[PDB]
Design a protein around this nucleic acid. Sequence first.
DNA 1: GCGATCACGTA
DNA 2: TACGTGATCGCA
Length: 577
Amino acid sequence: AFTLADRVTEEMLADKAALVVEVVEENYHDAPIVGIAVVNEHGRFFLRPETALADPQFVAWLGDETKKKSMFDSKRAAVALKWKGIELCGVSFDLLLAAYLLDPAQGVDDVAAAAKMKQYEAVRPDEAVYGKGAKRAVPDEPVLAEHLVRKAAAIWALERPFLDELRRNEQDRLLVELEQPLSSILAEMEFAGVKVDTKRLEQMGEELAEQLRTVEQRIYELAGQEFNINSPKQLGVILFEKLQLPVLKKTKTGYSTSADVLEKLAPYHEIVENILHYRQLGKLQSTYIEGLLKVVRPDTKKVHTIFNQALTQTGRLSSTEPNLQNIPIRLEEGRKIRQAFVPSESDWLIFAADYSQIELRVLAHIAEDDNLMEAFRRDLDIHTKTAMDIFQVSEDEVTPNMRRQAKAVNFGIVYGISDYGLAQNLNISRKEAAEFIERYFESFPGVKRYMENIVQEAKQKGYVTTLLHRRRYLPDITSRNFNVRSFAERMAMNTPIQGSAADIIKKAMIDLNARLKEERLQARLLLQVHDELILEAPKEEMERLCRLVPEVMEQAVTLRVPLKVDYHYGSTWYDAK
DNA sequence: GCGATCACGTA
DNA sequence: TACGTGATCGCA
């Protein structure tokens, strides 16, 4: 039983309530709110949004920090409301974030999935109510109102058992003091968006299309015929049947044509270099130029990413529409894409600050490896020092290739890759990659001990934890399949590193947001990308930020080694280098 | 019109 | 390693 309400009564404006502000469109930016449900001690209420959101008492209640609301995915609601000029405050419990902290592997997508964790099944999955894909539609008011009230009732019923388990896990503060405050910061970041210079992007796309026409023509005269270069089946027939290049790698369906294979085939035929070049130009044009231009809002000329705070098993943020975490950087041709990200006001600048080697610093701290801690206490180039140790040479004797291999070993630790993966990145044998690793563990015995100990702890406890008590369950750690078990072992080692680094960055964003307000700066966070925070600010604030931001980031936690922050500012993201 | 599948970019 | 995303193609 629920009141399908016609107007807002005071009964719906209690001190504590479960609240559903339903946004069905996957991209919630400027998206409709289809319905509102409130469950509190006085009953269960469904409100049409046009009513509720025009009611001054309702809107005042939404924005009253002392009126506590329990929700699922409150950022979606907060942002949808921001686009309507309405502030959502007082969200004291977000079930999406609670479920995520309790077990990130569950993939909790909707209220129903979180409710199942506590054997609560009186709510349907969103996909059963709205449908999937083409046939996705908002159902009739009776069906919609039942669904929203059921979601709000589930939230109401589930808050206590979820907070109880969080407390047993010592994750209650992680929820309340880190993830929920971050959610509000991310909602403001997403709402602010980042201004895009679409003229520059369109000019770049114009350039790429011309080179792509040129390289594509050269490819066709080399293949003796025309074909769809973007089809790895057609390309496979041109390279490996017509031109009879060696087959160095097979895929499930046929001939591998990854850039790894093509680089190896380059000496045999001039086509191969042009294919690689076509692949890189086409990646830029399709994915980044055309892809970015599709999601720039023509009103604001901004992109408004959506940060997914509750997806990764490490606690890292992901982002979509656009995904700004893979804007190119390595190749100069691609890094120029970042010239298109500009401050949103005249006489403002982009300020970007990034942790230097935060993952290895976290590893030095957690493993208490004396050699690694000393390397960071001396602020050495970690890759050079790793080369010196592994190859037992002095700094002047480290060749670029020795540093490259040491860097690949460090990369393998940071991202938890296998010996096979290291071998593949170093283009060496698996046996050779293995002996590289062993030489590393002789130089860093503390890291070796941490690796062994964390795997034993994962086996004993069932999970591993980060510095701020995020956990990752690893049921595959006892699997009898070697590849499955090795992956779980590498995740046991890696997640305390990657996840603690994510924890620090999140804490830094919270501290930064409060410091910006304390200092009454106009600067504002725009993006969190890997280990980098990107802000925009009046040019007149750059000198204050140069001092403030690195300090806040460096003081976010106290490790046994310093945190180091590099920072730059400029007129574009590219120039903030 | 989905859904693998392959390839590629940051990690 | 991961996630996100593209184009292709294979199944309807």
